[PDB]
Amino acid sequence: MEKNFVISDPRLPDNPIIFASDSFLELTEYSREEILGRNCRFLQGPETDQATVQKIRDAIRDQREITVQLINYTKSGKKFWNLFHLQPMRDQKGELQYFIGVQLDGEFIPNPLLGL
Ligand SMILES: Cc1cc2nc3c(=O)[nH]c(=O)nc-3n(C[C@H](O)[C@H](O)[C@H](O)COP(=O)(O)O)c2cc1C
């Protein structure tokens, strides 16, 4: 199955990417060496809704799952809608270990309705 996802380590500064799937690199047009060690906010750009970004920030803080749809950008500046799902991962002791983020490319929710 095709699967776009990245894994970050929130126990390192600014929650860097430590793994990115091959399909994620295909979707975003970045190479792995460009991405490792970066926060995934590099996919955002001028048309990204800051109110939606704030929902993600809150979800990270509370370590809760969240799904939002937002505009992201490829390396070449192509805009794509991203139905983005964030999932905390905990170790056996219940301590946060990783976050996984999964991206689905498509305008699933029409933008006029998303605007509401
Ligand atoms: C594992 C993971 C994957 C993420 N994937 C995306 C993504 O695909 N697109 C996106 O716009 N933001 C993504 N983010 C969110 C940004 O990295 C960042 O958390 C968000 O912009 C809010 O934090 P900031 O206000 O410090 O930028 C992801 C975050 C994590 C932890």
Description:
There is one protein chain. By secondary structure, the protein is an alpha+beta fold. It has one domain (1-116). 24% of the residues lie in helices and 34% in strands. The chain has four helices and five strands, in the order E-E-H-H-H-E-E-E-H. It has a five-stranded antiparallel beta sheet. The longest helix has 13 residues, at 50-62. It is globular and about 45 Å long. The termini are far apart. Flavin mononucleotide binds at residues 6, 8, 15, 39-41, 43-44, 53, 56-57, 60, 70, 72, 82, 84, 86, 99-101, 103. This is Phototropin-2. It comes from Arabidopsis thaliana (Mouse-ear cress). Residues 2-63 form the PAS domain.
Quick synopsis:
This protein has 116 residues and is an alpha+beta fold. It has helices spanning 22-28, 32-35, 50-62, 111-114; strands spanning 4-8, 17-20, 66-73, 79-90, 96-105.
Strand fraction equals 25-35%
Order of helices and strands: EEHHHEEEH
Number of helices: 4
The largest sheet is:
5 strands, antiparallel
The radius of gyration over CA amounts to 14 Å
N- to C-terminal distance: 33 Å
- Number of DSSP strands? 5
Number of domains: 1
The hetero molecules present are: flavin mononucleotide
Overall form: globular
* Spatial arrangement of strands, main beta sheet: 2-1-5-4-3
Features:
24% helix; LOV domain; monomer; 5-stranded antiparallel beta sheet; 116 residues; monomeric; Phototropin-2; binds flavin mononucleotide; alpha+beta; plant protein; 4 helices; globular; 34% strand
